[PDB]
Write a protein that binds this ligand. Sequence first.
Ligand SMILES: [Fe+2]
Length: 186
Amino acid sequence: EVLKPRTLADLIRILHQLFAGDEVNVEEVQAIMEAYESDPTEWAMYAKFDQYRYTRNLVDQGNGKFNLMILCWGEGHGSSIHDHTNSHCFLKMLQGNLKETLFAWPDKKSNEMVKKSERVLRENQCAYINDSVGLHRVENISHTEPAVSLHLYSPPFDTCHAFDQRTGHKNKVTMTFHSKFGIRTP
Ligand SMILES: [Fe+2]
């Protein structure tokens, strides 16, 4: 049924096709991303880790239609609570496991933020979020093993908001790249 990419390169070629149009079948993309079985030999050149925080490694720019990146989560590394600037956001496990916590959007009022969902992303699993779905944070469940995830964001975006869990108050964040196309960035 689902078109099974046999390599990361096959998957990228398919994604160029699915995003060439104006419509995007979210469930179709999710299934094909999930069908690709992670192969470290194919993405090791992008798995550039850092001691203190997770890293963002650009893989492909999707002919301007999407950002395809790989995120490298060290032991105990996790994200802030954040939004996704009106884009489709697909997140596939390549190695290890992320805990995904979904949060409701805060009010004008200051308040502890509310969890809507909490789950562990399995091997090769592809998850999906956008701003209408909620906010989230992802965390490596392991303090002894890394996690690696493949992210597709459509359209691409440079900035999002981080939210304080005690308050709901938000700061604008400009996202940066640790490496692009396997090459380290300034
Ligand atoms: Fe996210």
